[PDB]
Design a protein around this ligand. Structure first.
Ligand code: NI
Length: 341
């Protein structure tokens, strides 16, 4: 059955709760963003109201084939009424169309659900600053002090300079960027822009990108692989074997590959700065691991929560084991004692 952390008290609302069949009591199903763990169970066969951003709605319609009558897109940063309750959707700084939701309960309680997010100081001057938040449903993906990473901008700058140098040294090199879902689009779009190229990709991936309300998208992406010097491939193909194979497929138009695997955290975050990063190399193919994160680091999460000062925290990630929950509760108490709430 639907866990308590996906229910919003004093409403018949749920969030990211599509895998449990019909939820008893539920009159409106919110979807924070289009990642398969969160949407799991939604399909053309779902017949209840789904509330979401416009971008998430485009994806639901076109990729999952959910019928249009059941999709209720809402604009950002706007007070809206859903089934008699005031809500606001905010940018989560995660992947395209990802939202946090603010719920104003009839009794006067205020609840923030972060969905998946990457906490940032610009969220300190949104509609959140205007009133007290009593309860916080928190993306606790990286809630442990070992999880540090550079800013998105440091990582993009590194990627840009690396790619520009390699292709100026060898104008017959191909750049490849690995991908599995939506998110991290800036990696491949910034590389292409410094090289004066469009990004080439499969038909399914192109269809996905065409839903995302990215300005000038038609000038940036194509399905003609031939005509482009940055290609997207599935993450699973980003290895020496898959990359040599792809290079045979392109018809001797390129004689070298430089490939980027955007990952989350891995253990080498604990020593190496972004400037020290060096690739793995086998012959005429080089692979760079770059920690481009769309989740809060420990320090970013801590700052956001210390600012917000919620009366209660409800974790939404890593809640499946008692050890993880116990560990997280310890960090929440520390933050509360340091900050005086
Ligand atoms: Ni996500």
């Amino acid at each position: 059955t639907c866990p308590f952390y996906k229910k919003i008290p004093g409403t018949g609302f749920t969030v990211d709760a599509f895998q449990y069949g019909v939820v008893e009591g539920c009159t409106a199903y919110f979807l924070t963003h289009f990642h398969s763990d969160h949407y799991a169970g939604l399909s053309k066969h779902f017949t209840f109201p789904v509330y979401c951003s416009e971008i998430t709605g485009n994806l639901l319609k076109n990729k999952l084939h959910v019928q249009e009558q059941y999709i209720h897109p809402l604009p950002l940063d706007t007070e809206c009424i859903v089934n008699g309750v005031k809500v606001v959707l905010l940018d989560a700084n995660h992947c395209p169309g990802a939202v946090m939701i603010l719920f104003y309960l009839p009794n006067g309680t205020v609840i923030l659900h972060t969905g998946d997010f990457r906490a940032d100081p610009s969220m300190e001057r949104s509609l959140l600053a205007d009133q007290k938040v009593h309860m916080l449903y928190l993306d606790t993906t990286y809630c442990s002090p070992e999880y540090t990473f550079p800013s998105q901008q440091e990582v993009i700058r590194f990627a840009i300079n690396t790619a520009f140098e390699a292709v100026t040294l060898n104008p017959h090199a191909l750049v490849v960027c690995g991908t599995y879902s939506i998110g991290k689009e800036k990696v491949f779009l910034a590389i292409a822009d410094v090289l004066g190229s469009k990004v080439g990709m499969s038909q399914e991936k192109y269809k996905t990108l065409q839903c995302l309300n990215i300005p000038e998208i038609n000038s940036l992406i194509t399905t003609d692989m031939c005509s482009s010097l940055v290609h997207l491939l599935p993450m699973m193909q980003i290895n020496f074997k898959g990359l040599q194979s792809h290079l045979k497929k392109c018809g001797g138009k390129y004689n070298q590959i430089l490939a980027f695997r955007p990952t989350g955290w891995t253990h080498s975050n604990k020593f190496t700065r972004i400037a020290d990063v060096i690739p793995q190399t086998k012959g005429n193919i080089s692979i760079y691991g770059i920690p481009y994160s769309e989740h809060s680091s420990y320090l970013e999460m801590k700052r956001f929560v210390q600012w917000l000062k919620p009366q209660k925290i409800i974790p939404t990630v890593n809640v499946g084991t008692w050890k993880s929950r116990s560990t997280m509760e310890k960090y929440f108490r520390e933050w509360k004692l340091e900050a005086g709430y």
